[PDB]
């Protein structure tokens, strides 16, 4: 509750193993309004064969960010500091280890 | 989708060599993980083998798996018989829609993770209930989750999966439409919503955390739901 103040083209989805797109999720109260976001295109990887291998999974790796939310809603120069989760990309999992 | 078939038992002498097969209607076997788990009278279910024939720590090496994709079956081999093995053993392997247990073998001898379900009980026909699983000692975002039943008198049968960050849903076709799979990461707590029961789905409730989506490795206490 403690008000401060503070002075203010990758192709992967494309050529990964576990490919994705990517969505546009868009927030005008909040900075950055744009954030893209990834989800996976199948739920298997691509194997050497090119094929859709449904011995490994497609999973989106999701990180933590800050953000920052106009409070009060609608009100510039002025934010409340906040933490989402997104997801930057897939990777691909095997239940193997070795 | 697909069926397993099993034999529906088998009986030998202590110190011999027996083997289960299992069978799959469609698709190819060798496109698909083949698990193989053990059930002990009034315990639950635990894993053998895995991802064909991968041994977890803690089996001995007299059990092991094997496939056979020229009659498109999978099969478990148990070298030197002992009154422990005596249980039930069922296959298990997936679709990319949907997961399948085998009808189950009756294997007859001749004489950490931790998941916590909850929220069974009784209820009237057409009533509404919602179980609970509280998964811990795991990542719980990271892995896939599913519910598997044993109805009384039947094997096990898969009811619904989810992915680790909630995306995607999968149900059996006599389950669709009625039930709703959900999980919060927030609190590693897994959930099935439950509507328009029938008798048929009386039946205990299993939790289950899977490496990958139809690869079940670990298995909860189970609670029972009885419809009347």
């Known amino acids: 509750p403690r008000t401060v103040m503070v002075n203010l083209s990758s192709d992967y989805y494309n050529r990964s193993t576990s490919p994705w797109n990517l969505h546009r999720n868009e927030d005008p109260e909040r900075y950055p309004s744009v954030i893209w976001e990834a989800q996976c295109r199948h739920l298997g990887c691509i194997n050497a064969d090119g094929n859709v291998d449904y011995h490994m999974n497609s999973v989106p790796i999701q990180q933590e960010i800050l953000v920052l939310r106009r409070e009060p809603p609608h009100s510039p120069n002025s934010f409340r500091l906040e933490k989402i989760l997104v997801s930057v990309g897939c990777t691909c999992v095997t239940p193997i280890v070795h | 989708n697909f069926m397993l078939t099993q034999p529906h038992s088998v009986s030998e002498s202590p110190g011999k060599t027996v083997t289960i097969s299992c069978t799959r209607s469609?698709?190819?076997?060798?496109?698909?993980?083949v698990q193989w788990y053990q059930q002990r009278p009034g315990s639950s279910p635990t894993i053998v083998i895995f991802?064909?024939?991968?041994?977890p720590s803690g089996v001995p090496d007299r059990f092991s798996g094997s496939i056979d994709s020229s009659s498109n079956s999978a099969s478990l081999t148990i070298s030197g018989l002992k009154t422990e093995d005596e249980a039930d053993y069922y296959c298990?392997?997936?679709?990319?829609?949907?997961?399948?247990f085998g009808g189950g073998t009756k294997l007859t001898v001749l004489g950490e993770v931790q998941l916590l379900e909850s929220g069974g009980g009784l209820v009237q026909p057409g009533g509404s209930l919602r179980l609970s699983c509280a998964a811990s000692?795991?990542?719980?975002?990271?892995?896939?989750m599913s519910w598997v039943r044993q109805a009384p008198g039947k094997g096990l049968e898969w009811v619904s999966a989810?992915?680790?960050?909630?995306?995607?849903?999968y149900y059996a076709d006599s389950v669709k439409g009625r039930f709703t799979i959900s999980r919060d990461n927030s609190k590693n707590t897994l959930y099935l919503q439950m509507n328009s029961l029938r008798a048929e789905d009386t039946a205990v409730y299993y939790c289950?955390?899977?490496?990958?989506?139809?690869?079940?490795?670990?298995w909860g206490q189970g609670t029972l739901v009885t419809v009347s």
């Open positions: 991802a064909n024939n991968q041994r």
């Open positions: 989810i992915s680790g960050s909630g995306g995607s849903t």
């Open positions: 469609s698709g190819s076997l060798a496109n698909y993980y």
């Open positions: 298990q392997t997936y679709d990319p829609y949907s997961v399948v």
């Open positions: 289950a955390r899977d490496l990958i989506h139809g690869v079940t490795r670990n």
């Open positions: 000692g795991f990542g719980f975002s990271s892995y896939a």
